[PDB]
Amino acid sequence: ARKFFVGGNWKMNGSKASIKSLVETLNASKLDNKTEVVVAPPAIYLPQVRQALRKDIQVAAQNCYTKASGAFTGEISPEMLKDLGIPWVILGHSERRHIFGESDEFVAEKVKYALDQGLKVIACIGETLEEREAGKTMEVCARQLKAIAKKISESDWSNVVIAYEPVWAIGTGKVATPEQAQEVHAAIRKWLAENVSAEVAESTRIIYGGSVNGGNCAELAKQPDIDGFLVGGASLKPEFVDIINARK
Ligand code: NA
Numbered sequence: 001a002r003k004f005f006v007g008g009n010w011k012m013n014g015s016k017a018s019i020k021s022l023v024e025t026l027n028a029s030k031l032d033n034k035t036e037v038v039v040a041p042p043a044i045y046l047p048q049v050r051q052a053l054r055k056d057i058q059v060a061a062q063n064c065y066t067k068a069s070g071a072f073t074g075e076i077s078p079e080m081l082k083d084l085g086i087p088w089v090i091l092g093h094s095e096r097r098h099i100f101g102e103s104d105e106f107v108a109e110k111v112k113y114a115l116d117q118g119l120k121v122i123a124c125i126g127e128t129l130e131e132r133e134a135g136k137t138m139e140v141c142a143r144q145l146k147a148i149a150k151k152i153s154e155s156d157w158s159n160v161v162i163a164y165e166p167v168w169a170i171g172t173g174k175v176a177t178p179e180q181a182q183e184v185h186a187a188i189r190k191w192l193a194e195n196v197s198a199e200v201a202e203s204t205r206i207i208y209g210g211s212v213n214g215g216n217c218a219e220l221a222k223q224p225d226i227d228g229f230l231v232g233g234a235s236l237k238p239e240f241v242d243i244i245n246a247r248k
Pocket of ligand 1: 154
């Protein structure tokens with residue numbers, strides 16, 4: 001069975017003091033040992049967190065670039081992340097696609113380069129409010145996934161978790177209903193089966209993000225094609241523990 005997966009995306013939030021307190025809370029918490037947990041601090045706090053955090057929670061960067069090294073002021077390579085012992089990276093997050101203009105292909109290039117350099121990837125996809133209203137959610141998700149599949153192999157998928165995050169659900173306090181999320185997850189899984197392989201479809205975690213909190217996580221977690229969550233706002237708070245424990 002697919003191991004339940006909960007990721008915390010801290011985004012551009014944190015200080016030494018606030019992170020120390022967040023990590024202390026996590027370090028004292030009783031977590032379901034069947035949940036794979038990853039947290040993603042801002043890049044400059046990766047060392048602090050990797051040092052201080054319980055080793056059964058893994059650390060992620062929030063972005064990386066497509067080359068080993070070179071003249072890319074302000075960018076970090078996957079090699080650097082491995083060097084510092086950071087096993088995961090979030091790629092293609094809605095904010096990077098929509099605010100920072102990362103194309104489907106650029107995201108796909110990052111995913112391939114990160115995997116080839118030994119990182120595990122949370123690959124983010126999802127539709128805008130307008131695309132949802134048009135009934136084109138899966139067409140968008142399919143386009144974003146196809147770009148990734150063009151650049152990575154069948155075997156490469158073993159270290160990918162797909163995060164489905166409707167743009168209209170991110171930070172808006174409007175969560176997808178269990179029906180809405182389940183339908184997309186089942187459709188993504190079918191896409192994987194038809195375009196990549198049945199084995200990749202059966203094995204790949206598809207996690208939901210967009211306004212997940214302590215109050216709505218349990219019902220979402222009961223859906224047969226939802227394998228966990230990518231948590232933004234709630235990941236900064238003690239209720240993150242309740243989400244890790246959503247199946248408990
Ligand atoms: Na095969």
